[PDB]
Amino acid sequence: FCPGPVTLCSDLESHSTEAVLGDALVDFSLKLYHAFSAMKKVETNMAFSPFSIASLLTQVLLGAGENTKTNLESILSYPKDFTCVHQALKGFTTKGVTSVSQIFHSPDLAIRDTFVNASRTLYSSSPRVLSNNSDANLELINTWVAKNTNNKISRLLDSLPSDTRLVLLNAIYLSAKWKTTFDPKKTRMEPFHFKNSVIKVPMMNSKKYPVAHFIDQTLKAKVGQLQLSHNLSLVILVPQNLKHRLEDMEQALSPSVFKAIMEKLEMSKFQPTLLTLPRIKVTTSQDMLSIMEKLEFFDFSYDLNLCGLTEDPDLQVSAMQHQTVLELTETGVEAAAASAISVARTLLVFEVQQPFLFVLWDQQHKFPVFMGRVYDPR
Numbered sequence: 001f002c003p004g005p006v007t008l009c010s011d012l013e014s015h016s017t018e019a020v021l022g023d024a025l026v027d028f029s030l031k032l033y034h035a036f037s038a039m040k041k042v043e044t045n046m047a048f049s050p051f052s053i054a055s056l057l058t059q060v061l062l063g064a065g066e067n068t069k070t071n072l073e074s075i076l077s078y079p080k081d082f083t084c085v086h087q088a089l090k091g092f093t094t095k096g097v098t099s100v101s102q103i104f105h106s107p108d109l110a111i112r113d114t115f116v117n118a119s120r121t122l123y124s125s126s127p128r129v130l131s132n133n134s135d136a137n138l139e140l141i142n143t144w145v146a147k148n149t150n151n152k153i154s155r156l157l158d159s160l161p162s163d164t165r166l167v168l169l170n171a172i173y174l175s176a177k178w179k180t181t182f183d184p185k186k187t188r189m190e191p192f193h194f195k196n197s198v199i200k201v202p203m204m205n206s207k208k209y210p211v212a213h214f215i216d217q218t219l220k221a222k223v224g225q226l227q228l229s230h231n232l233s234l235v236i237l238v239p240q241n242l243k244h245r246l247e248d249m250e251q252a253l254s255p256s257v258f259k260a261i262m263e264k265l266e267m268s269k270f271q272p273t274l275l276t277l278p279r280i281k282v283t284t285s286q287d288m289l290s291i292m293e294k295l296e297f298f299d300f301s302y303d304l305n306l307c308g309l310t311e312d313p314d315l316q317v318s319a320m321q322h323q324t325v326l327e328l329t330e331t332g333v334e335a336a337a338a339s340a341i342s343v344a345r346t347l348l349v350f351e352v353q354q355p356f357l358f359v360l361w362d363q364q365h366k367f368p369v370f371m372g373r374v375y376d377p378r
Contacts, residue, residue: 002065002307005114009084014091017084018365021092024077025050025367026262027255029359031075033371035294036286037250043195043355047282047324047372051362052099052172055089056322059101059123060168062086063115063309068299075297086122092365096176096230100148103127104141104167105310115309127309130167134160145171152325156285164318168288173325174360174370179227180210181332190276193242193354194376201377203276204330208339211273212265213350215240218257219249224350225265229333231364235265236277236350237357246355246373253357262361272339277352278377280328288320326360326370 009017029050036046054076061072078085093099102125105111111127120126128144130137138160146154153171160167182204190203213224219237221244226234239249292300299305300317360370 003069005118005308006062006083006086009087014084014087017082017088018091020079020082021085021088022366023259025054026258027077028054028075029368029371030253030255030258031295032291033250033253035291036284037373038294039286039290043375045282045284045372045374045376047284047326047370048286048322049097049099049170049172049324049370050368051092051370052097052101052170052324053288053322055099055123056101056168056170058085058089059103059119060306060309062118062122063112063306065307066305067303068305071297071299075292075295086118090122090124092362092367094176094230094232094362094369096228096232097172097174097369098149098152099170099172100145100153101125101170102144102168103309104130104137104169106130106165107132109165109310109312109315111310112308130164134162134164137164141167141169145169149173153323156321156323157319161318166315166317168317168320170321171323174327176229176232178328178330178332179229180206180334180336182206182209182330183336184330187330191353192278192377199376199378201278203278206273206275206336207347208272208336209275210270211275211348211350212268212270213273213348214264214268216257216261219252219261220244221249222350223261223265224352225268225270225361227270228360231362232369233265233361233363234280234328235261235359235361236352237261237359238352238354242354246357246375249357250373262366266363271348273348273350275350278374279330280326280358280374281377282327282372282374283323283325284372285321285323288322289317291322292320324370324372326372 116126145156152173186205189200191198192201224236355375357373
C-alpha cells in the first residue's frame with residue numbers, strides 16, 4: 001500500500017496556502033538553526049537555506065508513505081493534508097538566488113513512473129540515474145552542480161559511499177545584492193569584539209544608509225534590516241552590549257519572537273543611518289543526515305518509506321548534502337542619495353561590531369531564504 005499521487009491544486013487554493021507555508025518555514029528555520037549550531041564547533045560562522053532544504057525535503061515528502069510521511073511533515077511543521085505545498089514552494093522561488101536540488105539514484109533502483117512526472121513538473125527535475133562506477137559518479141554530480149550553479153558550487157561532494165543507491169542534494173548561492181551601494185573608498189579597518197579580544201576587520205560604512213531598525217527587549221538585541229535587490233532584505237540581530245553572548249540570544253529566539261520581529265520590521269521604516277559592518281562572506285557545507293538525526297528524524301538511515309518514489313524494498317539515503325554560498329560586499333544596485341551635510345543634530349546609528357545572527361528574508365512571501373551567524377568576519 002502507498003498513497004496515490006497527489007492531486008494538483010487550483011491556482012487559488014495554492015495562493016491561500018502561502019501564509020501557512022511562511023509560518024512553517026519560520027518554524028523550520030529555527031529547528032535547523034539549533035541543529036546546525038549543535039553540529040558545529042562553538043564560535044563558528046554558518047549559513048544555510050531553510051527554504052531550499054525545505055524544498056528538497058518536500059520533494060522527498062512527495063514520494064513518502066507511512067511513518068516517513070508523518071515524520072517529514074512534523075519536521076517541516078506542515079499540517080496534515082497540505083497537498084498544495086509542492087506548488088506553493090515553486091511559487092516562492094526568488095530570483096535573488098540560484099538554487100539546485102536533485103535526487104540521484106543507482107541504476108538498480110527503479111523510480112516509479114508517477115514520481116517521474118510529478119517531480120519534474122513541481123520541482124523542475126526528475127530523479128537522475130547514476131553510472132555504474134563511483135569515481136564516474138562523483139565527477140558526474142560535482143560537474144552537474146557546477147554547471148547548474150554558474151560555477152559557484154563546484155565541489156558539492158568529497159566522496160560517496162561505494163554502495164550508493166540514493167543521494168539527495170541541494171546547493172544554493174545568493175545572487176541578489178544591496179539595493180544601495182556602499183562606497184568602497186569608505187571601507188575602513190574598525191574594531192570587532194571577538195572572544196575576549198578586539199580585532200580589526202574591514203567594515204563597510206555609510207553615514208546615511210537606509211536601515212530599518214529597533215531594539216528588541218526579549219532578545220536584548222539590536223535588530224536591523226537592510227534592503228537588497230529582488231524583494232529580499234538582510235536582517236541582522238546583534239546583542240546590545242558585549243555583556244550579552246550570542247549563545248543567549250540564540251536561545252531566546254523562539255518562533256513567536258522571530259515572527260514578531262518580522263511583523264514589526266515590515267512596519268518599521270527605512271531611515272538614514274550611520275551604519276558600519278563587515279563584509280558578509282559565509283560558505284557552509286553540511287552533511288544533512290546528521291542534521292536530520294539531530295532533529296530526531298531517523299527515517300533516512302532506518303526504516304525508510306519512499307513507496308511513492310520507488311517500490312524497492314531495501315532503501316536508505318546514502319548521502320544528503322547541502323551547501324550555501326552567501327556573499328555581500330560593497331556592490332549594490334543604486335548609488336547612495338545625497339543630503340547637504342548634517343541638517344540633523346541627531347543621527348540614527350546601527351553598527352555591527354560583535355558576533356551576530358542574520359536572516360535573509362523574502363519580503364513578498366514572508367520567509368527565510370537564508371539564516372546563519374558570523375563570529376569571525378575573517
